[PDB]
Design a binder for this molecule. Structure first.
Ligand SMILES: CC(=O)N[C@@H]1[C@@H](O)[C@H](O)[C@@H](CO)O[C@H]1O
Ligand SMILES: CC(=O)N[C@@H]1[C@@H](O)[C@H](O)[C@@H](CO)O[C@H]1O
Ligand SMILES: *[C@@H]1O[C@H](CO)[C@@H](O)[C@H](O)[C@H]1NC(C)=O
Length: 606
């Protein structure tokens, strides 16, 4: 179809499958294995990208061009690495991936939405769609084309450090919230074949259903450990949302570090090829986790030869190396040259990678759009995050006795009020993990509104607002306060750092609630990624709200505290009485919750 130097794969009017086959038929083994290789930006250079024909780059948590970088700085970084890849013989663009899991959360000034546990509490899949929509725009603001989300783990034990990354312990809720996928990617057309990848174009991103499969079912909630459950229970609890993800055209699937009955996911051919690919008919690309193939062995990295063979034969297509690319490429090349990995396996992997790249429009728009930079932290998106935060809140108590006046909603007009606690004025704590840094961080880490800021923004001008982080009992008694709002809870964490067998919040937390509530009628705002030991907090408090990890828009919290909207959130997880009960789900036998799944009190707007 026309000039003498025509190349079919470069013709945007041709069918994706024809473009994929055309390009594939031209590629050398080095060019094929290059597509299968994803490296960290920290090891990337123009020569490295060109000389090893690299297929993909990522930023891990905290991997940023610099602290405070603008959207434009991100675009220019991404474009520099793209220019190198486009300069190879075949000019195959790279795809850049990142953990944009509650907004474009590594980026300064990005809107930070509630983490998944709170979204589960909203029971609003359209809200979650809109969050996917907004997140795609903020990811494209930075020139990035690929988000490692959604996490569709079904967390069955809250001692897991990733429980906040699960929408719920109930798979039906997780299933409903796969609407994040068409938000991030665009809706699939009416004719669509389940399992095909889809991304609408340059204003959308490729998505990633993760981590396949049973990541939320591990023993004692130990992150990346073994999930012991029969096939029936794997398929009834952990798998279903993957089929909803196929039906919505999820582009990619990331494999879990976890094992299923002692078999590493990253080596599990029956599940990755037999089930995901051959039974679900998945046609996008399967990606490893970060040194996931290394960790097939114990110790990790003790037979990288075997890791490469096991993973690739199992059916993984792209490998998140992410640093030792030369070793990865060399070992895989050697296995193919030795006949240990057939060319049919390499060609399948490359076909899937190229199918996602052509489908999403990456060969037509390999570079960033500078007009999209201004999408970052946009007010419309902050309004959406505020709505989500407010909708996520679960009211657990609202009066000590059944005869007390309901504390919430609080009046905006009062002579003097107290805001107190470690989490009342700490933006980093209210965002939790995967925010700026991998593990999150403390204090004013990005643009947002703390709970204290939000109070000051909500109250009548005649209300005096006093902040004290950890006031003693006498301070409160002597202060002439109408009421207090006290915010306490967990510190930020991510992955194995968040694994916690006691689930008791750090001090001073309880002690400040006790001091404050001892003095004046109090509304306690509990910031956590999960249920935590709550009976002592409840005993002290007039009202108590489970606000989860509500993100940058702290006005969502005060929207409900002051009655602009009613409380509507409901527990998306069981609240336990004691950690000795765990695991405890919601049709066991020892099922004896403090608050059952679905519990939540309501108020009416004032
Ligand atoms: C590994 C882990 O999460 N351990 C926590 C620990 O940090 C804390 O000091 C302890 C108090 O019992 O609660 C548990
Ligand atoms: C007419 C009207 O405003 N009705 C609602 C009522 O349904 C609800 O019981 C009450 C207290 O929950 O809040 C208000
Ligand atoms: C689970 O963690 C335990 C305790 O650290 C360790 O013995 C074991 O290797 C882990 N198992 C798996 C499958 O990761």
């Amino acid at each position: 179809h026309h000039a003498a130097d025509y190349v079919l794969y470069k013709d945007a009017t041709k069918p994706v499958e024809d473009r994929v086959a055309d390009l594939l038929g031209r590629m050398t083994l080095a060019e094929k294995i290059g597509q299968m290789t994803q490296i960290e930006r920290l090891v990337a250079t123009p020569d490295v990208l060109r000389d090893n024909f690299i297929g993909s780059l990522l930023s891990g948590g905290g991997s940023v061009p610099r602290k405070g970088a603008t959207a434009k700085e991100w675009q220019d970084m991404v474009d520099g690495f793209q220019k190198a890849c486009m300069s190879t013989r075949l000019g195959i663009p790279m795809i850049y991936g990142i953990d944009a899991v509650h907004g474009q959360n590594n980026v300064y000034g990005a809107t930070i939405f509630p983490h998944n546990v709170g979204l589960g509490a909203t029971r609003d899949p359209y809200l979650v769609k809109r969050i996917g929509e907004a997140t795609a725009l903020e990811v494209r603001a930075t020139g990035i084309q690929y988000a490692f989300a959604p996490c569709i783990a079904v967390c069955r034990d809250p001692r897991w450090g990733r429980c906040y990354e699960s929408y719920s312990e109930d798979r039906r809720i997780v299933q409903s919230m796969t609407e994040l996928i068409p938000g991030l990617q665009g809706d699939v057309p009416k004719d669509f074949t389940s399992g095909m990848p889809f991304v609408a174009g340059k204003n959308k991103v490729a998505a990633c259903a993760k981590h396949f499969v049973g990541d939320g079912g591990t023993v004692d909630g130990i992150n990346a450990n073994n999930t012991i459950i029969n096939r029936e229970g794997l398929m009834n609890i952990h798998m279903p949302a993957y089929k909803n993800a196929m039906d919505k055209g999820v582009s990619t699937v990331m494999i879990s570090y976890s094992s299923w009955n002692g078999v590493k996911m990253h080596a599990n051919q029956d599940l990755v090829t037999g089930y995901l690919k051959d039974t679900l008919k998945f046609k996008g690309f399967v990606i490893s986790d970060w040194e996931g193939i290394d960790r097939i062995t114990t110790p990790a990295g003790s037979d990288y030869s075997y890791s490469v063979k096991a993973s690739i034969l199992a059916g993984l297509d792209m490998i998140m190396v992410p640093n030792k690319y030369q070793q990865f490429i060399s070992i895989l090349t050697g296995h193919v040259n030795g006949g240990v990995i057939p060319m049919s396996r390499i060609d399948d992997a490359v076909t899937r990678i190229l199918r996602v790249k052509f489908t999403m429009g990456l060969f037509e728009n390999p570079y960033a759009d500078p007009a999209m930079a201004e999408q970052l932290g946009k007010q419309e998106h902050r309004d959406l995050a505020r709505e989500a935060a407010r909708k996520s809140l679960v009211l657990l108590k609202n009066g000590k006795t059944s005869t007390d006046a309901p504390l919430l909603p609080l009046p905006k007009k009062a002579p003097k009020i107290l805001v107190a606690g470690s989490h009342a004025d700490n933006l980093g704590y209210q965002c939790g993990g995967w925010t700026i840094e991998w593990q999150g961080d403390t204090g004013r880490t990005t643009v947002g509104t703390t709970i204290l800021e939000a109070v000051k923004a909500a109250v009548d001008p005649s209300t005096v607002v006093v902040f004290a982080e950890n006031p003693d009992a006498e301070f409160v008694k002597s202060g002439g306060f109408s009421y207090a709002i006290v915010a306490v809870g967990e510190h930020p964490y991510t992955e194995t750092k968040g694994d916690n067998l006691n689930l008791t919040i750090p001090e001073p937390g309880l002690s400040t609630v006790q001091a404050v509530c001892g003095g004046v009628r109090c509304a306690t705002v509990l910031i956590s990624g999960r249920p935590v030991v709550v009976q002592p907090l409840l005993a002290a408090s007039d009202a108590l709200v489970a606000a989860w990890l509500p993100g940058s828009e702290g006005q969502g919290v005060t929207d409900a505290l002051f009655g602009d909207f009613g409380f509507t959130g409901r527990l998306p997880r069981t609240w336990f009485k004691s950690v000795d009960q765990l695991p405890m789900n919601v049709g066991d036998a020892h099922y004896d919750p403090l608050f059952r799944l679905g519990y939540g009190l309501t108020t009416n707007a004032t």
